[PDB]
């Protein structure tokens, strides 16, 4: 069964990106302006 692994990756990717987006975008906005 490959379910448990893919689930794990779904979770992990989802969180690292969950917090991942606000941070990256924040860094970019800080780059272009201030």
């Amino acid at each position: 069964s490959g379910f448990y692994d893919r689930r794990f990756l779904k979770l992990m990717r989802f969180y690292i990106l969950l917090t991942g987006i606000p941070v990256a975008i924040g860094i970019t906005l800080v780059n272009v302006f201030i």
Binding site: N31, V32, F33, I34
Partner: protein
Amino acid sequence: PVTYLTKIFDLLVDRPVTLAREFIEQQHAKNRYYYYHREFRRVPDITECEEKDILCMFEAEMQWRRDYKVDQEIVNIIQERLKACQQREGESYRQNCAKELEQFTQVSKAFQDRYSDLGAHYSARKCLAKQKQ
């Protein structure tokens, strides 16, 4: 006909970013709160503070340490200029690179001298102890 003309087409690919930079740089100009360099005043050295004051040894120690790190940075610079000369020659060198090689020889010589077998826990008292030697 010249192949390199293709670069002109490729130049258009540069142009986009060029314009793009303005679209950033413009906004970057709009607000520019900014830093500037820090500097530290001179202090009397360990050689003249007495055998037991810790504060003299300490102030002078920090000064000596800053001076050391600085000197390392200078050797970094002279090496970088060395690399620059080396690549910059087409194939010749043993030329201007000999010129930099000389100043590097002197600099690395003296820097080798000031700061060699100090070992870990290098300390100004030791560089002194070497200088007297």
